[PDB]
Amino acid sequence: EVSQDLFNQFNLFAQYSAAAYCGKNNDAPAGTNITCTGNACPEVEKADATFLYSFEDSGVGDVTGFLALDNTNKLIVLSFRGSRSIENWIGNLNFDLKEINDICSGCRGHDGFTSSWRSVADTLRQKVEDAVREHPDYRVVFTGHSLGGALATVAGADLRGNGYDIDVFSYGAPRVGNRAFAEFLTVQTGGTLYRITHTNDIVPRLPPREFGYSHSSPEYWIKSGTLVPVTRNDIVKIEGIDATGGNNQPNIPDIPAHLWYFGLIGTCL
Question: Helix or strand or coil: residue 195?
């Protein structure tokens, strides 16, 4: 159900997302080869991919990630790590909205996601700008898993428009705000958001719609199970804001489903 070219992209960026968690890169010197433990990011190691800027517990909501240079794939990748211990994050998750009129008219988004990014926006926007300068030809891609999918989606919605297309690839990210914010992210030009979901992952079901939240469209749903290899025939595109029968279905959600996106993610062997 999706193309090989999209599958390969989905795969790479899951690993850039898995590398946020899986070591060396929570803070390591610039220009250094990006590497993971326990086979989390072998397509990243295959490339000439190095760090530009590593950050850790930055900003108000403690944002951890790395900005990278990938000369093989010709990318400029800004990756965000989800929470260090996710089970707790989910449970402690507050559903408070807060306005974000600077991103889009009449848009409210998750107050925490929104304030954390808002707090590192200027340093990170800056760092992304110098990379664009140095490599005008390179594709600018934001990505993250979980909470990092949120942050990469909120940073993508906010930085697009300044002359460089921003592609977002988010893995099991939670909803990020209201219908209007959903509509903005569905149609916001200057980049494509690839909201990737997996079977019954619980994170995408949060925060609930009942608290004023909506999802972007479309959705790329992986149907293979936890710990099952993913192929191009296991992903199906699902169209419609708040669409159903992809992750958003009435059955019992699950945590282990959240840690398997193409491979192990959100946790390091």
Answer: strand
Residues 1-269: name the CATH superfamily.
Alpha/Beta hydrolase fold, catalytic domain (3.40.50.1820)
Which of the residues 70, 158, 167, 201 is marked catalytic? 201
User: Of these residues, 17, 79, 146, 217, which one is catalytic?
Assistant: 146
Q: What is the DSSP letter of 204?
A: G
96 is catalytic: no
Could you tell me if 166 and 252 are in contact, meaning their C-beta atoms sit under 8 angstroms apart?
no
Give residues preceding each break in the chain, C–N over 2.5 A.
Answer: none
- What sections of 140-267 are H helices per DSSP? 147-159, 179-187
How many whole angstroms separate alpha carbon 170 and alpha carbon 191? 13
Residue 226 identity? T
The residue count for the chain: 269
- CA within 13 Å, CB half, 263: 19
Phi, psi of 139 (to 5 degrees): -80, 135
Question: CA 133, CA 204: separation in Å to the nearest integer?
Answer: 35
Annotated catalytic residue 146: yes
Could you tell me if 58 and 81 are in contact, meaning their C-beta atoms sit under 8 angstroms apart?
A: no
Q: How was this structure determined?
A: X-ray
CA atoms of 124 and 119, how far apart (whole Å): 10
- Residue among 56, 177, 28 at smallest CA distance from 120: 56
Rounded-to-integer distance, Cα 218 and Cα 155, Å: 19
Task: List the domain boundaries for the chain.
Answer: 1-269
Enumerate residues 6+ apart whose C-beta is below 8 A from 211.
Answer: 95, 97
258: annotated active-site residue = yes
- Could you tell me whether strands 235-238 and 219-222 are parallel, antiparallel, or unpaired per DSSP bridges? antiparallel
E strands of 214-253, at which residues? 219-222, 235-238
